Design a protein around this ligand. Structure first.
Ligand SMILES: Nc1ncnc2c1ncn2[C@@H]1O[C@H](COP(=O)(O)OP(=O)(O)OP(=O)(O)O)[C@@H](O)[C@H]1O
Ligand SMILES: Nc1ncnc2c1ncn2[C@@H]1O[C@H](COP(=O)(O)OP(=O)(O)OP(=O)(O)O)[C@@H](O)[C@H]1O
Ligand SMILES: CC(C)CCC[C@@H](C)[C@H]1CC[C@H]2[C@@H]3CC=C4C[C@@H](O)CC[C@]4(C)[C@H]3CC[C@]12C
Ligand SMILES: CC(C)CCC[C@@H](C)[C@H]1CC[C@H]2[C@@H]3CC=C4C[C@@H](O)CC[C@]4(C)[C@H]3CC[C@]12C
Ligand SMILES: O=C(O)c1ccc(/C=C2\SC(=S)N(c3cccc(C(F)(F)F)c3)C2=O)cc1
Ligand SMILES: [Mg+2]
Ligand SMILES: [Mg+2]
Length: 1156
């Protein structure tokens, strides 16, 4: 990463942007390598930028009664903003004085050589004044966006738990996405809000020089046009506000359904998901089309006022006194500049100010939210004391408190066991202790140092070692002792690079017990006064749980204050204190002694998506050609008081007025533009549908390589550019191309020498564009790819917020966010610099060619007229060449969308339910190690099978291999029907599967239980009562109509397990594949699963995986996974007698049941 060459660039080198020549050469010849990227300047660093803005905003907050972020932004960049605006205005005056000089030349036809030299000198100054100032404005905008992004992230980690619930990741990601690249380049257009009125005043004086008070009619026409455009912009801002919330909701749902894709595939819910997304897109697209209709009219004002302004300006003068055609010809040159200023530069600047002030107001609104607070003592005894503590989940109710008068006291070094049934408030008690839930009555008192292990494991991107260390120094002895105690040596040995294997966020490649043990190891590794643990042994088998409980809790952490949630009697035996809760009330508190007593291919693909687009383009081309023919015959007809036309002189001026009106003669009306934007917005709808379908049909081996931030990137930014930015960019490019072509045809016949000179310029522009785009496309692709790490870090940090706050690693996460910000900044800065170089060089070619043409014309009557015509043609060519670069920039998102669309595809009878398996081998990757090898067994119809094995052995791998969700190789048959014979949909429809990872999406209770809307509320209530969900469901304001958010955050773990059981009961399948249905349930609640298994699945084949022993009392066949091989048994007593350690680890109640 070589230091930026801009650092040691000379004054002339910085002025002409000539330090970008190396990167251009390298990109032109070869594909860019990593070593070709340069370090960001030391001014653009996120750390320093955010530190400055934080100082100014912190001063504003305390100082003022009405803090506003605009004052802090003013104090950081006001003088640089104005500095660049001064030179911008200076360069805009040159565009206004140039017509004056042209008119003096025309009227004069020795003075004309001096006039030509001065006109040629104006071009040079305009180039050295505008391009350096425009780039300085883009730099200010970039620095403002970085500092605002850093302040937002630092606020996110301080948000309160009560306000967290309402803020969604969709809203968070939409905020950043809107101003990601827009805010930076909006800075250049802002100064025109005051520059344009001054240009109007100067131009009005210069037009009074000729037409006296007659110019005020054209001025009034332009004023009415400006009021019309203001109304149009006001109307445009209305729809986008309506659309924002729908967009955020769509993003939330798409992200959740992509995260739980294996559950979606197992349930065969792809069609319901697609239907929901299409329902949201209909509503969004209705407002998108309305906004596009309005923006078309706003963008057609410049091209339709051309004839009207000139005609109105000269008409009163002509009606009072005879006018000469020379004056009429001279008025068009001023009118072009004035129209451009009134109908294009002023309204765009006003819209820029509106959007920027709105974005800054939204950011301030976010920055003034409610924050997290807590209290502790350094002089405490390292005891934990709770005194009559009552807690309310909802702040408004504090209704029914979740906890009521909880009392407990523990001195340093003793254990406190916390028992109770589902929904009793154990996790809530831990939350109150952590300070995330503020009590309504009572007070908690401990020392601040706390270590937490959540009931739902959290994982972050990086190696296993990085996860355990979590941001502190690496201690070899401590790390090895913790690894040994947590029983992770056996499992880490299997990995290729040991613990150095990189883990995807959320631990997608690990088993549930492995994720639980990694989280436990992280907590054990941290040194703290208190250790909060929530169901750490839930996903583990009995022998592993016993080993961890003895070696990690009762040996490794003997002299630590500890709290442990457990429902096991063996675990309650060793606890110094016991606290039994029930429905948020202290049923019991005391010892166990007291309890016992009790490329152009992209352009082609885009154009041919929809037939309507082809028809519309053909229609527009046909009408263009008809207009060109009409103009030609009209010119031929003219060839063969109110006005003063003489055959001797000024008869020639007529044709040149006609060419002067070409901008309005060739403009697209509402019969050619509205259909063209409508059809492009149809193309966008089609592409989004295709992309979603491909993603949902892709194989898992392909889906497990994607990053949540990358999929969010593609579904948030790319879709928006196609929906809004691309349609009107293409409209403007088409308009400019048409005008240029028609003008070239008509002007060649009048003066041939203009045509034989326009082509050299066109050739030079084409060659330069082709040279530039080779490198600019590679920089654009890099920039587009640079946003995924930012989105991914945002998603991960929002997922692990309670753990981050509990441990205290906020500085570490802020550092990593700044790293990703700098990564995006490097590529964005390089892309903007190369773009400025290209535009500066295009202007230099224009200046050179005009100098040559003007000097040759002066060396060799109609010279001034020909100069005017030439300048109009060349300026329109430059405008079109810049619009083409914009369009090419926007087509890279089309290419990315097509890349995601081109993903590979994944790939009566159910009666007895009999199943045969023969020589089955399963792996996750081609050329990878086989998790299972040489499987073979048989299952009789209507029989119960118990699947057993140590954590991380391949039970979920076998259940996935049944559904063919990974690489499979063998023969499985059901009722004598091979899985090869029938389609994958048919094969998967015969299984009722309960996944180990629960999938709750954002939507109503009955939608969560029934996405296809086939069952009736009576049957749904019957099933809900059948699985003990009536009480839970009827505790919310909407019974079956309450909307769950944040993946069922208002539900407990056991409640989610019961919802999955209810889904499986609603499905009526002959074969059932259950994957640990009782994960964190107490034996009382397990009676539900027992009754349901015996009654609901009365005549069905059942393959039950479960680490619980009582469940093994309800099975006849047994399949034990060991060393990648499954051994078959028919008696659990025979199975246990062969294994000593497992039988020794069986609890006394379990062995009382097994052996009576
Ligand atoms: N964020 C929340 N907002 C509102 N209510 C909640 C929230 N989280 C849990 N609850 C409710 O508070 C009660 C206590 O739930 P909690 O998670 O503390 O139960 P638990 O005893 O830990 O259960 P489990 O044994 O399933 O882990 C439940 O009725 C639950 O629906
Ligand atoms: N997507 C994956 N890619 C590669 N290896 C995987 C993937 N998922 C799981 N594994 C590996 O397969 C092995 C078995 O995992 P599996 O989830 O089948 O275990 P399990 O016996 O069901 O464990 P648990 O009792 O924790 O549910 C583990 O070593 C795990 O790391
Ligand atoms: C040909 C004769 C009759 C007309 C003369 C018109 C006069 C008023 C015009 C011609 C050139 C103009 C100046 C050109 C450049 C600038 C620099 C700018 O930063 C402020 C306006 C200012 C200072 C203009 C003021 C008006 C001006 C002096
Ligand atoms: C905002 C700034 C830049 C523009 C100020 C407007 C200036 C340039 C305008 C306002 C009044 C105008 C003058 C009005 C009348 C005449 C008489 C004419 O025989 C020569 C030009 C001359 C002298 C004009 C020159 C330009 C002028 C001075
Ligand atoms: O600074 C900028 O971006 C910038 C600068 C200059 C322009 C000039 C333009 S636009 C347009 S239309 N015409 C025009 C007018 C009458 C006739 C013709 C014909 F027929 F010859 F093509 C073309 C121009 O002269 C646009 C933008
Ligand atoms: Mg819990
Ligand atoms: Mg598993």
């Amino acid at each position: 990463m070589q230091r930026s060459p801009l650092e040691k660039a000379s004054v002339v080198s910085k002025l002409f942007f000539s330090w970008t020549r190396p990167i251009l050469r390298k990109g032109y010849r070869q594909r860019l390598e990593l070593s070709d990227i340069y370090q960001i300047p030391s001014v653009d660093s996120a750390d320093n930028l955010s530190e400055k803005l934080e100082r100014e905003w912190d001063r504003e907050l305390a100082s003022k009664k009405n803090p506003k972020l605009i004052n802090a932004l003013r104090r950081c960049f006001f003088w640089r903003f104005m500095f660049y605006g001064i030179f911008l205005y200076l360069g805009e005056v040159t565009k206004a004085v140039q017509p004056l000089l042209l008119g003096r030349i025309i009227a004069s036809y020795s003075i004309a050589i001096y006039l030509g030299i001065g006109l040629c000198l104006l071009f040079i100054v305009r180039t050295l004044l505008l391009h350096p100032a425009i780039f300085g404005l883009h730099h200010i905008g970039m620095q403002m966006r970085i500092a605002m992004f850093s302040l937002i992230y630092k606020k996110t980690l301080k948000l309160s738990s009560r306000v967290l619930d309402k803020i969604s990741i969709g809203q968070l990601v939409s905020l950043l996405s809107n101003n990601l690249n827009k805010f930076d380049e909006g800075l250049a257009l802002a100064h025109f809000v005051w520059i344009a009125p001054l240009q109007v005043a100067l131009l009005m004086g210069l037009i009074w020089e000729l037409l006296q008070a007659s110019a005020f009619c054209g001025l009034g026409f332009l004023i009415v046009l400006a009021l019309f455009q203001a109304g149009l912009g006001r109307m445009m801002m209305k729809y986008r506000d309506q659309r924002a919330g729908k967009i955020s909701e769509r993003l939330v749902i798409t992200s959740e359904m992509i995260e739980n894709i294996q559950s979606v595939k197992a349930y065969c819910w792809e069609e319901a998901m697609e239907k929901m997304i299409e329902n949201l897109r209909q509503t969004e697209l209705k407002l998108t089309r309305k906004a596009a209709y309005v923006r078309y009219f706003n963008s057609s004002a410049f091209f339709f006022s051309g004839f009207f302004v000139v005609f109105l300006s000269v008409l009163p003068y002509a009606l009072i006194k005879g006018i000469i055609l020379r004056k009429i010809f001279t008025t068009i040159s001023f009118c072009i500049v004035l129209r451009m200023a009134v109908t294009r530069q002023f309204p765009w600047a006003v819209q820029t100010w509106y959007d920027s002030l709105g974005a800054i107001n939204k950011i301030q609104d976010f920055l003034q939210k409610q924050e997290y607070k807590t209290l502790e003592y350094n002089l405490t005894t390292t005891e934990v004391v709770m005194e009559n503590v009552t807690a309310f989940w909802e702040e408004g109710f504090g209704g029914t408190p979740v906890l009521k008068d909880i009392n407990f006291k523990i001195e340093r070094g003793q254990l406190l066991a916390v028992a109770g049934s589902t929904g009793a408030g154990k996790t809530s008690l831990l939350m109150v202790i952590m300070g995330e839930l503020e009590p309504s009555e009572g007070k908690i008192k401990h020392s601040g140092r706390i270590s937490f292990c959540s009931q739902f494991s959290w994982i972050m991107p990086g190696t296993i070692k990085e996860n355990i260390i979590f941001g502190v120094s690496y201690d070899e002895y401590r790390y090895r002792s913790v690894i040994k105690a947590c029983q992770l040596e056996e499992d880490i040995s299997k990995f290729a690079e040991k613990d150095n294997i990189v883990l995807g966020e959320g631990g997608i490649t690990l088993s549930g017990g492995q994720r639980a043990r990694i989280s436990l190891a992280r907590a054990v590794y941290k040194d703290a006064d208190l250790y909060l643990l929530d169901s750490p042994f839930g996903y583990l088998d009995v022998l592993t749980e016993k080993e961890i409980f003895e070696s990690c809790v009762c040996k490794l952490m003997a002299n630590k204050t500890r709290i442990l949630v457990t429902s096991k009697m063996e675990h309650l035996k060793k606890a110094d204190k016991i606290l039994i809760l029930h429905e948020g009330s202290s049923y019991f508190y005391g010892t166990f002694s007291e309890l016992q007593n009790l490329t152009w291919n992209t352009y082609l693909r885009y154009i041919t998506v929809h037939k309507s687009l082809i028809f519309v383009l053909i229609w527009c081309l046909v009408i263009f050609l008809a207009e060109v023919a009409a103009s030609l015959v009209v010119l031929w007809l003219l060839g063969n008081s109110y006005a003063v036309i003489i055959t001797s002189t000024s008869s020639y001026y007529v044709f040149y007025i006609y060419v002067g009106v070409a901008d309005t003669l060739l403009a697209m009306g509402f019969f050619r533009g509205l259909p063209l934007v409508h059809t492009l917005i149809t193309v966008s709808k089609i592409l989004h549908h295709k992309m979603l379908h491909s993603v949902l049909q892709a194989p898992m081996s392909t889906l497990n390589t994607l990053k949540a931030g990358g999929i969010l990137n593609r579904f948030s930014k790319d879709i928006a550019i196609l929906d809004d930015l691309l349609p009107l960019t293409i409209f403007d490019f088409i308009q400019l191309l048409l005008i240029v072509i028609g003008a070239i045809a008509v002007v060649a016949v009048l003066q041939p020498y203009i045509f034989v000179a326009t082509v050299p310029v066109i050739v030079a522009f084409i060659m330069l564009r082709a040279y530039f785009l080779q490198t600019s496309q590679q920089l654009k692709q890099l920039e587009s790819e640079g946003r995924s790490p930012i989105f991914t870090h945002l998603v991960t940090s929002l997922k692990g917020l309670w753990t981050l706050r509990a441990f205290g690693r906020q500085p570490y996460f802020e550092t990593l966010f700044h790293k990703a910000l700098n990564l995006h900044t490097a590529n964005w800065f390089l892309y903007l610099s190369t773009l400025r170089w290209f535009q500066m060089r295009i202007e230099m070619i224009f200046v050179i060619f005009f100098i040559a043409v003007t000097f040759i014309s002066i060396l060799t009557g109609r010279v001034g007229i020909i100069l005017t015509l030439a300048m109009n043609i060349m300026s329109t060519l430059q405008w079109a060449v810049n619009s083409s670069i914009d369009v090419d920039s926007l087509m890279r998102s089309v290419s990315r969308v097509f890349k995601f669309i081109d993903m590979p595809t994944e790939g009566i009878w159910p009666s007895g339910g009999q199943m045969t398996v023969k020589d089955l081998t399963a792996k996750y990757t081609e050329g990878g190690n086989a998790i299972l090898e040489n499987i073979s067994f048989s299952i009789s119809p209507g029989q119960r099978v118990g699947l057993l094995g140590r954590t991380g052995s391949g039970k979920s791998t076998l259940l996935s291999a049944f559904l063919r969700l990974l690489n499979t190789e063998g023969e499985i048959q059901i009722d004598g029907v091979s899985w090869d014979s029938i389609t994958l949909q048919q094969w998967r429809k015969a299984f009722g599967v309960i996944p180990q990872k629960v999938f709750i999406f954002s939507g109503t209770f009955r939608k969560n239980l029934d996405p296809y809307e086939q069952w009736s509320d009576q049957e749904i209530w019957k099933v809900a009562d059948e699985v003990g969900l009536r009480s839970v469901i009827e505790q919310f304001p909407g019974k079956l109509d309450f909307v769950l958010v944040d993946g069922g955050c208002v539900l407990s773990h056991g409640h989610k397990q019961l919802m999955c059981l209810a889904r499986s009961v609603l499905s009526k399948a002959k074969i059932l594949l259950l994957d640990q249905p009782s994960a964190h349930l107490d034996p009382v609640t397990y009676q539900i699963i027992r009754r349901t298994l015996k009654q609901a699945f009365a005549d069905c084949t059942v393959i039950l995986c479960e680490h619980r022993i009582e469940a093994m009392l309800e099975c006849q066949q047994f399949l034990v996974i060991e060393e990648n091989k499954v051994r078959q048994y028919d008696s659990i007593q025979k199975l246990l007698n062969e294994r000593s350690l497992f039988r020794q680890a069986i609890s006394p109640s379990d062995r009382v049941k097994l052996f009576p």
